[PDB]
Each structure stands twice: as C-alpha cells, then as structure tokens.
Design an enzyme around this catalytic site. Structure first.
Site, PDB file in Angstrom:
ATOM      1  CE1 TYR A 198       1.124  -0.433   4.363  1.00  0.00           C
ATOM      2  CE2 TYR A 198       0.360   1.830   4.287  1.00  0.00           C
ATOM      3  CZ  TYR A 198       1.063   0.825   4.917  1.00  0.00           C
ATOM      4  OH  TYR A 198       1.707   1.075   6.106  1.00  0.00           O
ATOM      5  CG  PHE A 244       0.403   9.636   5.432  1.00  0.00           C
ATOM      6  CD1 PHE A 244      -0.683   9.552   4.580  1.00  0.00           C
ATOM      7  CD2 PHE A 244       0.497   8.733   6.477  1.00  0.00           C
ATOM      8  CE1 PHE A 244      -1.652   8.585   4.762  1.00  0.00           C
ATOM      9  CE2 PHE A 244      -0.469   7.765   6.662  1.00  0.00           C
ATOM     10  CZ  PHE A 244      -1.545   7.691   5.803  1.00  0.00           C
ATOM     11  CG  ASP A 245       3.167   4.712   5.477  1.00  0.00           C
ATOM     12  OD1 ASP A 245       4.169   4.889   6.196  1.00  0.00           O
ATOM     13  OD2 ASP A 245       2.728   3.579   5.190  1.00  0.00           O
ATOM     14  CB  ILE A 268      -5.632   2.140  11.789  1.00  0.00           C
ATOM     15  CG1 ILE A 268      -4.392   2.899  12.255  1.00  0.00           C
ATOM     16  CG2 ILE A 268      -6.841   3.042  11.935  1.00  0.00           C
ATOM     17  CD1 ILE A 268      -3.793   3.775  11.182  1.00  0.00           C
ATOM     18  CE1 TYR A 293      -2.212   7.341  14.183  1.00  0.00           C
ATOM     19  CE2 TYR A 293      -3.069   7.258  11.954  1.00  0.00           C
ATOM     20  CZ  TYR A 293      -2.110   6.913  12.877  1.00  0.00           C
ATOM     21  OH  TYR A 293      -1.043   6.136  12.495  1.00  0.00           O
ATOM     22  CG  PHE A 322      -4.704   3.568   3.719  1.00  0.00           C
ATOM     23  CD1 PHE A 322      -3.383   3.611   4.126  1.00  0.00           C
ATOM     24  CD2 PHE A 322      -5.679   4.065   4.564  1.00  0.00           C
ATOM     25  CE1 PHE A 322      -3.042   4.144   5.349  1.00  0.00           C
ATOM     26  CE2 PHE A 322      -5.343   4.598   5.789  1.00  0.00           C
ATOM     27  CZ  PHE A 322      -4.021   4.637   6.182  1.00  0.00           C
TER      28      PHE A 322
END
Lengths: 184, 260, 430, 107, 324, 181
Positions: free
Chosen positions: D26, D36-37, D56, D82, D99
């Site tokens: 992912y 961010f990822d 999560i 979050y 995602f």
C-alpha cells in the site's frame, strides 16, 4: 531564435565532431566550453508559461506600497505606455468539503455571477487592473460578517476585474473566453 | 605494509603545502605518531582488553547493550523519561550475572566513572536550593555502593572520587527515605574495611567533615522547620551521618587506626 | 517625560547624540577580523572579553532593556512622530535597530553574561512579534541560545509555538531554522523535549516547510491532426478514434504508472497548448487546456472525478477505449469496452485546434486505432463520428510528434527551435 | 464510515477471516494528496494478522472485505483512524486518510 | 471573519491585520526553464501497420520536485540552482531535519523517514546535477535518520576488546605474518564482543508500536553496492581533474561520499570481499596520491584511523588466542 | 607542528588541557637530542640536533607552554620542562638569547608568575606520610606506590624544573641572570 527558426549548439566535448576548431581556435590557445566535463550541460531556456512573481522594488512603472483603522495595500506607477496587469495575492484561501460558495458584493448589494462550485480547491485572490496615467486601485482586507476583501476602485473603472482564481498562467488582453469545463 | 604508505602520505601532505584547519594537522600528527610508536596502542588497549569464556555470551551482550544505553543517555540532558531509562539500565546491569564473576571487567569498562559523571550532572545546578531528581541520585549512589562493595580494588578506584563527593555529601540526608543510597554513604562504603585506604585517607577531607558536623550542630535544617518540627537549636541527623562516616574512617577491622 | 503624559516639550532628547553613541559603541564591540595575525586576534579577543565583563557587571544590559522597553510602547515611526517630533519620529527605527545590535554585540561571546540575563527570554520572545525589529530579536535569541545551554532549560512550549508562528507569519526565513537547530542541540548534548516539540508542532500539517516528493517522468503522443470550428469552412464537427493496449504494468518502480488519454485544446489556433510547462508529472487533464480519461476518473484542470461504469477498472492489458468528440453542442465522450461512461466534459471552451493525445509515464505499450491503412477499428463508431485518418487534410502526410517540442533522448544534435506561427491558415471576396 | 472504491478486481473469492495473516502492498496519502506513507518505497510488503488489534481499524475492517489480487481505494474517517489527536509528528488532528491497498497473498 | 484569519494559524482573531507574507504578485515573464538531461526514450513503431498506430515506452525515469504550498506549485529539484533563496532555505531545512534527530532519538526519526521519503534520499544521493549544498544536506540526513545511532553505539565500544574463548576464537593464533606476507587490515576473523544491530520497520498504520527502540529500517546491500560504484566513479572523475565535479566544487563531490563510506565502514558492513575491493581502490603501489582538498584528507585521516584500529583489534585477538 | 602547538598554547583559556598530542610529541622532540675529539664531536652533533628544531620555534613554544599553565603541576609542564632540558643541554647561548628576546619583546608576566607558582608547590618530604606507609607495610604487604611511595611527589619534575632554571642561566649570561631577579 526567431519565428520558425531551428538551430543547433555545440559546447565541445566532441572534438571528433567539432568542425572549425582546427581552422580557428586550435592554435591561439582557445578551448571548447565543455572540454573538461564528464556530463552534458543542462541547457536552460526561456519559459513561455507566465507564472506569478513578487513585485520587485527595482521595477519601473509598477510600484506597490504598504500602509498600516484598516490595513490597505496601495499601488502606484509612473509610465508613458499603458497595458493591463494581473495582480494577485500570495496565499490562497482553501475550501473544505461542505463549504462551496462565492458571491461578489459591490458597493450596493450582491449582484454578480453565481460562481459557487468548489469541492476542495485553492482560490488565490486577485484583481486585473488596467494601467492608467494615475492608477490608485488597491486591495483592502475589511470585515462585515465573514472574509471580505474590498479591491477599492477609483476614477476610470470600466475594464478592471476582481475575483478569485486558482493556478492559471495566461497572459493576454481579453474579457471572457476563459477556459472552462462542466463534468457530468 | 600499511605503516609504510601511511607514513609516506603523511610526510608528503605536510611537505607539499602549509595546511590550515589545525584539527586536520592534529589528526595527521596523531596518525603519524600511532604509526611510529606501534606498541603504544598495545600497552593502552591490553588493560582495557578482557576474555571471559565460550559459554556466557548473551549475558555479557545484554550488559554491554545496557552500558551503551547508559552512555547514550549521558549524552542527553536529564528529563523524566531519561531518569526512567537510566534507572532501568542501572537495575539491569546490577541484576546481570557477569557483574559478579568478573569485577575487573567493570573497572576496565569504566562503568563507575560513567555513573559518577551522571551523578555529578544531576548534583549540579545548585547546592542548597534544589536537590531535584532524587531517585536518580539514589540509584547512582546505590550502584556505586554495590560496585565498591564486591571487590578490593573498586574501593581504591572510588577513593579518588571520594574527595570530590564529600563537598556535596550533604544531599539526600535528613530524610529517612534513603538510609542506603547517599554520597556520604558511598564514601563510607568505599573507605570501609580496608586498613590501607583508611591510612591513605589523609586530612584534606576529615576537617571538611568536621566543619560540616559543626555547622550541623550549630544550625538546624530549614526543611525540618518547614515540615513543622519544633525547631530545636541544632540538628541530630546530618551530625549522626557525619559521625557514622567518621566512625568508619577511624575504626577498621576491630582496631582503631592510630593516626586517623 | 514625554511618554508618561502630555507635558511641555522642554525636555532633552539627545536623538543624534544617542545615535552617534550607539554607532560608536557597536564598533567598540566589533569582533576581530579573520584576516589578522593569530596573536593579535587573541589579544583583541581577550580585550573584548574583558570589556564585555566590565559592561555586564554594571547592569547596563538591563539598562538597554529598559530603553527598548520604553521605545517599544509605540507602533511605527508615524505613531512616534506626532508625539516626539520629526527627528525622533524618523530616527526611532534606526535607534531601535542600533540598540538591538548593541545588545547582540554585548553578548556575542560571553558565556557568563548570557547565563546572567537568560531570565529575560520570557520578554524577548513575547516582543519577538514586533515585525519591525524581528530580525534583531531573532539574531539576539540565536546568539544567546548557541552559547549557554541553561537557557534551553527555560524554553517552554509557548516559546517554540511563538517561533513557529513567526516562521508561518513572516515567511521563509533561514534564521528561524538556525534558531530551531540551536534549540535541538546546544553543546554536543540534545534536549529531547525541544526535539519532540519541534517535530510535533512544526511539520505535521506540511503547510510549512517546503514539502517534497519523487514523481515519474511522463510524456505525451499526438498525431498531426488539427480541428478548428468557426463560421465558414467546417470539418463536420465529428471525430472518433480507438485505442488498445498489448502489455502494461501498474507499478514499474515506486508509483502508479501514469496512463491517460483524451483531447487537448490549443492557444488560439497555434501549437504549444497551455498547461504543466513541460517535463513534469502532468499529462492530459492536468490543465484547463486538456481533457483526459484513465479508466477510473475524469481529469480536467489537475482535478480528478470518479465516474460510474460497468466493471470500472484501470486500463489493464487488452483494453479497447474509443474517444468521441463533437464540438458545438455536445462534448468529448469515452466508452470503455463499448459500453459508454456516465460522464462528459460539457460546456467547455471550443476555441483552439483540438487533437487526440495519450499520456504515459513508463512501462506501457499503446496502440492508436483508426480506419484504413493506419489501423482497424475494434468497435463501430456512433453515427456521424468520423476519424482522424479522415480528419487529415487532403494531400498531406500524417505523423506523430510528441506533444510540443523535441522531447527526444538525443545528443547535442537537437534542433532547438524558437517561436512559430499559427500555420498561416488557422469566404470569397464581396 | 470507511468506504471502498475498487481499482482492479481480485476475482472476489478468497476473503480475510479471523485467524489469518494478510500480505498487502500500500501507498497511503492524506486528503490533500500529500503522501504520508507507502509500502513500495522500502520494497517490503506489509505483513499483519487479522483481528489482533495491531493496525488501525479503518485499515483492518477494510482489508477484511477485500480479495486476493484486488486493488482498492480505502477512504477513512478521523475518529476511526486517529481521532482528535492524530499521530504526533505526521498526521494532524481530525484528518482523513486514503490507502491504495493491493493484496499480494492471503494466508 | 477575515481574509487573513482564514489562511493562517489563528482564526479567533477578528482584527484584520496583514502579515509580511501577503504581497502582490503580478504575472511576470522573467523566468528560465531547465531542459532535462534525460528523456523518456519513447519509440514509435514507424511501420504504420494496418492494425493500429504503435507507441512503446519501457525504460522508467523518475525525478523529485519541491512543492511550495502557499503557491500550490511543483518545481523540479534541479531548478533551485538559480534560485539562491529557496536553495539556502532548503539547505537549512535539511539541517533542521538532521538536527531534530541528531542524537539517539528514534521516535522523531521514524516520523522523518516518511516526512521526506525512503528512496527519494537514494535518488538525491544518486543524482549528479545537485546544487551541492542540497547534496550534502541529504547525505547528512540519510546518515542521521538511520546510520548515526548504530554508528555511535559501535564507536563507543571501539576501545573495549572483549573476546570469548570459543574454539573459533582459537583459530587466528597465526595472524599471518611470516612466509613474506602481512595480511590485510580488517580481513580475517573477529570473534569479538560487539553491539548487535537491528532496525525496526517504519509503519504508521500499525497502532501501538512496541518500542521503536533502535532505528528505522533501511536496505543496506543496495546502499553499499551503490557507494562502491559511486566511489569508483568519483576517483575516476577526480583522476582527470575536470571543471564540473558533482555538486559544484570537488569538496561537495568527495566529502559527503567519503563520509557515508566511512560511517558504513564503521557500522559493520563490507564483508571481506568488499573490503578487498575498497582497499584495491586506494592501495595499489589511487585516492591517497591525488591532489585532495583539506576536508577530503580530513576524512581520509579518520579512515586510516579505523584501518589502524582494526589492526590493533586483530593483534589483541591474536594475543588472546596464543595466551590460551 | 611547532606552530600548531604554539597556537594551541596561545589560545586564551583558564586551564591547560591534557593535550595528549603534545604529551606524545614533546617526548620524541626531547629524546631526539643526544679523547678530545670524541667529546667535542658529540657536542657538535648535539648543537646540530638542537638547531634542527629550535630555529623552527621550539624555544618560544616551550616558553608559551610554561606560561599557559599559570602554576599547575601536571603532565604537560612535566614534558615541556624535559623538552627545555633537551634543547638547553650545555651552554646554548643562542637558545638562551632567543628566549630572552622573546620574553623582552612580549612583556608577559604569566611566565614568571607561572614559574613562581610551579616552584612554590613542587614537593617536600613529609614525615607523616612516610611513617604511615611504613605502618601500612608492617601491617600488610601493600604494593609500593609508584610516585615515590607517595611521600615525595614528582621529585623528577622538581629536578627537571630546577635544571631548566639552571640551564636558562648556564654559562655566565648576566642579562638573563638579572632578568630572573
């Protein structure tokens, strides 16, 4: 290069391909521009798309001052040739998912186009003013109930516009004919 | 053949041009001196070398990891989490088994000096206006006490810092929460039960203890008058600790040291 | 006597005198030049150290602090002018700058004096938002932070938040970053509290500082086709062309391979349409002069919008798409595997010479599909819609340039070109 | 609150159930497009058990409805991702996440 | 409530002030563009087959770009060469990125890894046309986020020679020195107690990370191969003394590269064959014979210090093996 | 190297640091130096070995190192006094005159006050420590202390300091004899 003119540059590094080096340059101690290089030159050019730039202090015929009650951003100019400018504020206001509206309220009431469509976009504030002999049109951040910017006009105000715009890079002299698209 | 070309390049660089950046020339000359002396590295490193066995490896690896974490924490300013990690690491190195079978390894690693340089950082800041981070002081004091206890030579090692720590031995006392961990108590433990160290204990510090005892017998502790005690004209706590340390200094193995 | 209330102006305001005194004292604390003999430099250093010690041991740092306190009670030169006179009003800014320079010079090197007045940082960081002395206050805070590590012990969350708000308000200053660097480490030792504060309060939002990313190199392909509608000579206003793919790869190195297709406008009736300037990650649909489709979303002005479609999927291998374009009343349309999509770019600007284009990043094998000798249609065009092999003008060849310019991997033998004309041709006599 | 927009079908046969380990690949991104990822940068897939409360919720409940070889767009909600505190340093408070998850293997 | 109170941090301040960032920007024409040095190399079929128009593109190509948010515009990394303000600001930004995780702080490094990227650092260290300051900053940041912690932890235990008494330790008692040979520094067997290395995987979708105690994970094999290749290329470039070193001057080319190679050599990589190849780079009797600037020889000194320390350690291990 | 050491000793500080580099190289520089022809030829090779480095600034480097300690008996002065000894072995009037000219052209007091502070605290045989060590040996076989059984501290340092003060006035240099008073 002028209109429909194509060419070719050679900064060296290929002496086997360089033609007129032995004819002139090889004997008077003249060297190629890129003889001692391990990689080619980046070859910068002049871009066409006209992006926004901050008004420099050493710029003729365009002066932008700053004062400060209320905060204002006055203008000024000294020139003999006239044109149209595309002045714009630096930081744009962003809109969330729900909120999506924009109304242009003049001196009287709200009477303008219903440009109220923005799911999530950045609207940079701007005003397109024509350059007169004396041009004191300016922007004033004021307040009545919400975010209000008053681009206060003066005498001879018939072709200057003031709105909010996203990233747009086009230099010309037109009233409409702006690019658009409606996705169904 | 490494020394050959190293010494060649070493002299060639300095002979070719004058060299600014004095740190460069300092590194160059220490390199040249290392290449020429040769056995200096050996005589320096063999005291710090050690061999244990081919069986106890994971234990000493955990000990070295904990000591490295302690040193890394030293390189950082003290905070709450820093104190917690330091206490954890001290507990881990105390509980490790290699700590007991090979006490010379701890001295060769200079763990006592590391703990000493942690406690001096905590004990700084002030002298009589703040004793902040008291648990960190206590953990260092008890670790040093245990370290000096299980040996004959670690007492001699700690005797060197005994002179310094007697200046700030007044901290952690006047409170029956640390009857163990204390700079004065680690000083007493270092000089405890060794006639050689008891004799070598000359008088740059016995008079210091006597002045501390006199000050304690003339002035009571402001912390006591703050707690709400009846303000006796003298203090029986710091005096008792100084008297205990003096007793440890004078009496050894059942026979009083005559000079002390 | 002038700032307390309205009093008669028989006061001694040595404006020029104090300006000259500050200008002399600043040079009195001038650090020694680096182009000096080592022993002379050390002598000057010792002299300036002793000077700073004797000036601090008299409490004159607090004196200049009180002076700048009493001078900061105004707002601008205009505010000070109508109260203290023309000379004082016009010299107030220079006097403040000289006072801050003197305060900085008095603390440039000493470790003792900074540890003495560190208690004034609560005031310094509060007035740090004056906006007319921010440079001086920032330099002073930088010089006092890089010397004494105890001053970092009194820096709380409020001070760091104030510094970050200054960086967010006054723009991109390269000295705020040095101040934060000195706040992270002071002398070979780090403070985890300030490090965590900086990391948690400065760059979670990504609005500041300048972000960065690694994108792919995308290119475009277009045939020698131009479509111009107006009064007079028209070209039936109906075009159609198909596209198939042999082999594809979604992620070649790190990101999804760019693959879009549509119709791009022009500027007037000339080449070089406006958009992502060149050699970027912008294909078709990433500007207001192009309209593309990639299998999932409709792209227009670097803004994608998802649309429903039977078995909506990315343009995998062996997928046949056909793009239709009418100019006047309707707009461009796309059909995936024959079944049309549920979206179109209606009410768009018809000014310009439209042309088919395909944009790809890497790892792609695409096939344009026309009629005749150029290709073979896989599906049937809707009634009326012609194709590009018929859009070509009679008795002219048809080739495929890239999109604009010489985006060819070639050596110095590249034909760099200047501006061009609008084809010199883009009604009888009365 | 998590919604799914499929990008490439994964034959919709094998679904993650409790007591299994899933392999995903992912490249997450914020709402404004700010990445961010990603799991393709480090070139190592992300291995995680299903139902052990290690990832999560907005990710696990979304991955539990996907198939082998199926790429999907997972849009999350701040309370399910979050909350009002976010991730200290990276995710600002009250932020939505996206995602692009592909399932390589399902064991 | 206000215009300024909408695009700034604070919003509950209804006073219409104007920060210095608010300045008028006009559509100007004084702007240069940079022609890239590498293209996509797209090949058209050129056959015009009767079954379509073929276009083919296989070789990938990537590039990194800064994103100015208040201008909402992307600009290639290499365009900063002309703009000195953005260049200096981004250099100081990299300095701050390295400073917030300078010491053994890993909670912040795990965030910074995603804050910049994982492989964008590799692209920056691989690119040739870098402004120099940005190249050095990216090198330092790459060292700081991953390698620095374990490098320091391994350098603290560099003067402490703990050695077990294993049967494998009882094998270097020869320390080959006779029959006309001296061996090679760092080549052989260690069997010495050294702090173990482990890096955690940076993942932010996983809730309640255990401790993230050590470091963010980073691929070391590709990094070491890449370092060896660039070091060979760099020595070949410096041998001919051109006028366009990577990153501007020659110090910008050599200092970050030799620093990364040195910290990699410290942290316990470059197994025997790799040490042989790196040695043959300098040893033939190269790199020590060139005309090197002061910051380059300053790193050469530390390199030679490590080459002497490993020999000292080997001597100590042989001493223990014989003493057994 | 001599200029590096001189600059390090000239940098204004409050305490002479350890400076292992200096402690290692001033011993090499000290051990570098050293029937009628057999006793003069060696004296001439000694003059040559001393001229091999005192014309490069060692005569002033030793003076600066002694001045930069302001009277602190340590392993730094203990090595620069030996370097001064090696550079003033015999009546080297040239080196004496170079140091005298240096001290007269740079009117520094931090050298003479440093000499006074060093000599005021060199060493004295203390009887208490002697009988204490004797009693310790009688009670148990305690290892002998390295620094003269911890009863005479750095006697070699004291002898080297006074030999240096002697060599500074060796021969009959009345100028330096009066400048020392």
């Amino acid at each position: 290069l002028g209109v429909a003119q194509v060419g070719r540059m050679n900064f060296g590094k290929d002496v086997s391909t360089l033609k007129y080096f032995t004819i002139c340059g090889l004997q008077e101690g003249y060297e190629p521009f890129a003889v001692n290089t391990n990689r080619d030159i980046t070859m910068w050019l002049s871009k066409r798309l006209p992006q926004f730039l901050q008004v420099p202090s050493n710029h003729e015929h365009i002066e932008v001052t700053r004062i400060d009650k209320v905060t204002q951003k006055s203008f000024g100019s000294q020139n003999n040739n006239t044109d149209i400018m595309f002045y714009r504020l630096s930081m744009p206001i962003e809109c969330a998912x729900x909120x999506x509206x924009x109304x242009x309220x003049x001196x009287x009431x709200x009477x303008x186009x219903x440009x109220x469509x923005x799911x999530x976009x950045x609207x940079x504030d701007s005003d397109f003013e024509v350059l007169m002999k004396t041009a004191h049109g300016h922007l004033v951040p004021d307040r009545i109930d919400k975010d209000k910017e008053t681009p206060k006009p003066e005498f001879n105000n018939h072709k200057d516009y003031a709105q909010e715009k996203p990233s747009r890079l086009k230099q010309x002299x037109x009233x409409x004919x702006x690019x658009x698209x409606x996705x169904x | 053949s490494l020394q050959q070309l190293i010494s060649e390049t070493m002299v060639r660089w300095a002979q070719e041009s004058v060299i600014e950046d004095p740190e460069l020339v300092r590194a160059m000359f220490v390199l040249l001196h290392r290449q020429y002396d040769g056995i200096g590295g050996l005589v320096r490193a063999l005291p710090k070398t050690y061999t244990i066995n081919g069986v106890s490896v994971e234990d000493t690896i955990n000990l070295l990891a904990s000591l490295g974490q302690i040193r890394s924490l030293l390189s950082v300013r003290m905070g709450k989490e820093e104190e917690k990690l330091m206490i954890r690491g001290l507990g881990d190195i105390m509980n490790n088994k290699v700590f007991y079978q090979h006490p010379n390894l701890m001295r060769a690693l200079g763990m006592h000096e590391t703990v000493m340089e942690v406690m001096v950082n905590v004990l700084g800041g002030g002298e009589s206006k703040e004793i902040t981070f008291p648990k960190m002081v206590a953990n260092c004091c008890r670790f040093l006490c245990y370290f000096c206890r299980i040996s004959r030579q670690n007492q001699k090692a700690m005797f060197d810092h005994l002179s310094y720590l007697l200046e700030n031995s007044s901290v952690g006392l006047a409170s029956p929460a640390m009857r163990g961990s204390t700079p004065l108590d680690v000083a007493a433990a270092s000089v405890m039960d060794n006639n050689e160290l008891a004799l070598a204990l000359r008088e740059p510090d016995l008079e210091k203890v006597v002045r501390y005892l006199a000050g304690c017998g003339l002035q009571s502790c402001q912390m006591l008058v703050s707690k709400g005690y009846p303000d006796i004209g003298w203090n029986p706590v710091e005096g008792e600790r100084y008297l205990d340390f003096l007793r440890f200094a004078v009496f050894c193995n059942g026979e009083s040291v005559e000079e002390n | 006597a002038l700032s307390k209330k309205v009093k008669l102006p028989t006061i001694d305001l040595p404006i020029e005198s104090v300006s000259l005194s500050l200008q002399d004292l600043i040079g009195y604390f001038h650090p020694p030049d680096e182009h000096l003999e080592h022993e002379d430099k050390q002598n000057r250093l010792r002299a300036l150290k002793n000077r700073q010690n004797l000036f601090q041991e008299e409490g004159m740092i607090n004196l200049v602090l009180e002076c700048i306190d009493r001078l900061h009670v105004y707002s601008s030169a205009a505010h000070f002018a109508d109260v203290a006179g023309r000379e004082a009003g016009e010299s107030w800014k220079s006097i403040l700058n000289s006072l801050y320079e003197l305060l900085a010079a008095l603390i440039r090197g000493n470790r003792k004096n900074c540890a003495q007045f560190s208690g004034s940082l609560d005031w310094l960081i509060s007035r740090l938002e004056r906006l007319e002395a921010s440079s001086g206050i920032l330099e002073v805070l930088h010089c006092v932070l890089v010397e004494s590590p105890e001053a970092l012990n009194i820096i709380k969350e409020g001070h760091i938040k104030s510094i970050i708000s200054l960086l967010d308000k006054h723009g991109r200053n390269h000295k705020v970053l040095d101040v934060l660097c000195s706040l992270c480490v002071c002398h070979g030792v780090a403070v985890r509290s300030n490090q965590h504060l900086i990391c948690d309060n400065l760059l979670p939002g990504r609005d500041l500082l300048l972000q960065t990313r690694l994108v792919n190199h995308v290119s475009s392909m277009r045939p020698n086709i131009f479509l111009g509608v107006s009064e007079g000579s028209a070209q039936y206003k109906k075009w159609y062309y198909e596209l198939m793919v042999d082999h594809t790869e979604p992620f070649v190195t790190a990101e999804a391979t760019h693959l879009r297709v549509g119709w791009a406008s022009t500027e007037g009736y000339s080449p070089y349409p406006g958009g992502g300037e060149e050699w970027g990650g912008n294909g078709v649909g990433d500007d207001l002069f192009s309209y593309g489709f990639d299998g999932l979303h409709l792209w227009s002005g670097c803004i994608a919008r998802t649309v429903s479609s039977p078995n909506q999927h990315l343009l995998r291998t062996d997928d046949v798409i056909s793009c239709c374009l009418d100019l006047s009343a309707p707009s461009i349309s796309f059909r995936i595997n024959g079944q049309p999509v549920q979206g179109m770019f209606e009410n768009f600007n018809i000014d310009g010479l439209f042309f088919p284009v395909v944009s790809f990043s890497a790892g792609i094998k695409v096939r344009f599909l026309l009629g005749g000798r150029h290709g073979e249609f896989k599906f049937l065009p809707p009634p009326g819609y012609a194709a590009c092999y018929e859009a070509v003008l009679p008795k002219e060849k048809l080739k495929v340039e890239h999109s604009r310019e010489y985006k060819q991997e070639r050596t110095y033998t590249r034909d760099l070109l200047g501006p061009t004309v609008s084809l010199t041709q883009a009604v009888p006599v009365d | 609150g998590v919604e799914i927009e499929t990008i490439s079908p994964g034959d919709g046969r094998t679904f993650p159930k409790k007591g299994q380990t899933c392999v995903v690949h992912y490249t997450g991104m914020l709402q404004n497009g700010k990445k961010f990822d990603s799991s393709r940068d480090r070139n190592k897939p992300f291995k995680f058990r299903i139902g052990k409360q290690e990832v999560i919720k907005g990710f696990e409940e979304g991955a539990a409805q996907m198939s082998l070889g199926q790429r999907a767009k997972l849009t999350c909600t701040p309370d399910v991702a979050y909350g009002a505190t976010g991730h200290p340093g990276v995710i600002p408070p009250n932020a939505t996440l996206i995602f692009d998850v592909e399932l390589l293997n399902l064991e | 409530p206000l215009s300024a109170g909408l695009f700034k941090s604070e919003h509950k301040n209804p006073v219409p002030q104007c920060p210095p960032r608010l300045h008028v920007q006009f559509l100007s024409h004084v702007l240069w563009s940079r022609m890239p040095n590498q293209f996509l190399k797209v090949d058209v079929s050129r056959i015009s087959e009767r079954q379509g128009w073929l276009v083919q593109c296989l070789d990938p190509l990537q590039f990194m770009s800064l994103h100015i948010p208040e201008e909402n515009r992307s600009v290639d990394i290499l365009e900063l060469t002309e703009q000195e303000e953005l260049l200096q600001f981004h250099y100081h930004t990299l300095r701050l990125y390295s400073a917030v995780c300078a010491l053994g702080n890993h909670r912040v490094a795990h965030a910074l890894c995603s804050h910049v990227d994982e492989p964008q650092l590799l692209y920056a260290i691989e690119n040739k046309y870098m402004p120099g300051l940005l190249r050095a900053g990216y090198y330092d940041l790459l060292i700081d986020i991953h390698l620095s912690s374990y490098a320091t932890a391994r350098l603290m235990m560099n003067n402490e020679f703990i050695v077990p008494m294993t049967e494998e330790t009882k094998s270097i008692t020869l320390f080959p020195d006779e029959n006309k040979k001296h061996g090679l520094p760092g080549i052989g067997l260690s069997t010495s107690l050294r702090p173990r290395m482990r890096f955690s995987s940076p993942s932010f979708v996983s809730i309640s990370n255990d401790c993230y105690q050590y470091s963010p994970e980073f691929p070391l094999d590709i990094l070491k191969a890449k370092t060896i290749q660039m070091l060979t290329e760099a020595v070949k470039e410096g041998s001919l003394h051109a006028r366009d070193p990577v990153g501007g001057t020659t110090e910008f080319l050599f200092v970050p590269l030799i620093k990364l190679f040195y910290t990699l050599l410290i942290m316990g990589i470059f197994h025997n064959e790799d040490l042989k190849h790196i040695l043959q780079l300098i040893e033939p009797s190269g790199l020590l014979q060139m005309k090197l600037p002061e910051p380059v020889k300053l790193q050469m000194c530390l390199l030679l210090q490590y080459l002497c320390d490993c020999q000292v350690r080997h001597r100590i291990e042989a001493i223990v093996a014989f003493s057994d | 190297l001599i200029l590096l050491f001189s600059r390090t000793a000239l940098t204004e500080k409050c305490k002479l640091e350890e400076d292992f580099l200096y402690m290692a190289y001033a011993d090499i520089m000290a051990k570098s130096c050293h029937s009628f022809e057999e006793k003069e030829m060696e004296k001439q090779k000694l003059l040559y070995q001393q001229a091999r480095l005192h014309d490069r600034g060692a005569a002033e480097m030793v003076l600066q190192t002694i001045s930069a300690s302001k009277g602190e008996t340590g392993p730094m002065v203990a090595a620069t006094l030996k370097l001064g000894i090696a550079i003033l072995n015999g009546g080297n009037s040239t080196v004496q005159q170079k140091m005298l000219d240096y001290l007269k052209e740079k009117k520094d007091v931090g050298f003479f006050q440093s000499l006074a502070g060093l000599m005021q605290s060199c060493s004295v045989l203390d009887l208490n420590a002697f009988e204490r060590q004797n009693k310790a040996e009688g009670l148990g076989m305690v290892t002998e202390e390295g620094s003269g059984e911890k009863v005479l501290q750095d006697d070699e340092f004291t002898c080297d300091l006074f030999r240096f003060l002697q060599l500074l006035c060796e021969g009959h240099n009345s100028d330096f004899q009066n400048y020392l008073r």
